[PDB]
Amino acid sequence: DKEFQSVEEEMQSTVREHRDGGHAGGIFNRYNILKIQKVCNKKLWERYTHRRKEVSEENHNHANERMLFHGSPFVNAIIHKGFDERHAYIGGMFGAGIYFAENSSKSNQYVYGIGGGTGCPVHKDRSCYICHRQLLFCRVTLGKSFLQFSAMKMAHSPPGHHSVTGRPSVNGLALAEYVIYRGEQAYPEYLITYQIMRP
Numbered sequence: 001d002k003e004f005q006s007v008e009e010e011m012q013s014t015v016r017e018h019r020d021g022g023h024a025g026g027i028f029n030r031y032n033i034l035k036i037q038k039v040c041n042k043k044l045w046e047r048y049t050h051r052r053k054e055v056s057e058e059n060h061n062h063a064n065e066r067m068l069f070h071g072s073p074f075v076n077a078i079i080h081k082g083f084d085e086r087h088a089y090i091g092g093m094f095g096a097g098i099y100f101a102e103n104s105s106k107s108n109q110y111v112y113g114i115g116g117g118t119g120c121p122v123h124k125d126r127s128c129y130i131c132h133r134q135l136l137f138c139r140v141t142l143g144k145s146f147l148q149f150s151a152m153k154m155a156h157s158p159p160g161h162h163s164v165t166g167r168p169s170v171n172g173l174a175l176a177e178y179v180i181y182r183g184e185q186a187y188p189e190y191l192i193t194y195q196i197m198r199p
């Protein structure tokens with residue numbers, strides 16, 4: 001389908017060269033996309049659309065929805081139970097939120113844990129070209145997004161806002177990131193199974 005070619009194109013075209021020289025996510029310029037599955041979870045979709053309507057009403061009739069990537073070792077729990085802010089902690093750059101990227105390669109750095117953890121379960125390699133990885137391509141409601149450049153450890157969205165946008169700066173994020181503080185503000189629409197490819 002054209003729908004899945006659109007997802008593959010977003011995955012491939014948003015890859016960037018990372019500052020860590022590939023330490024966290026591995027060394028690659030492209031992926032080998034193995035499978036793209038649309039997630040159809042009615043209960044999660046209804047939780048998402050209900051919140052999206054509330055946010056839209058609080059943001060001049062505009063949800064400010066974006067399709068963004070999410071990398072996590074807990075993708076299977078997310079598809080079944082949804083995103084859950086109770087699993088987020090204050091330590092992150094923008095505090096206790098759920099983080100998303102517009103660059104697939106940035107989310108890929110989080111698939112095996114913080115900073116890529118110890119890499120794949122079988123070879124303990126953050127740059128494994130063999131093991132199949134999974135990323136989510138999500139529908140995210142940003143609403144009135146608070147624009148921020150430096151670390152700001154929050155527990156919740158800033159007053160009057162529905163999310164935080166981390167914007168690139170000098171010392172300094174390299175790439176954007178988007179943070180929500182309510183799990184119902186995102187829907188895990190596509191599950192992408194892939195490998196990073198050796199350059």
Ligand SMILES: C[C@@]1(c2nc3cccc(C(N)=O)c3[nH]2)CCCN1
Pocket residue numbers: 069070071072091092093099100101106107108110114115177178
């Ligand atoms: C390190 C962490 C993180 N930062 C991100 C920025 C953009 C995307 C993601 C993602 N999961 O795809 C990120 N995850 C996890 C919790 C504290 N912040």
Ligand SMILES: [Zn+2]
Pocket residue numbers: 120121122123124125128129130131
């Ligand atoms: Zn491996």
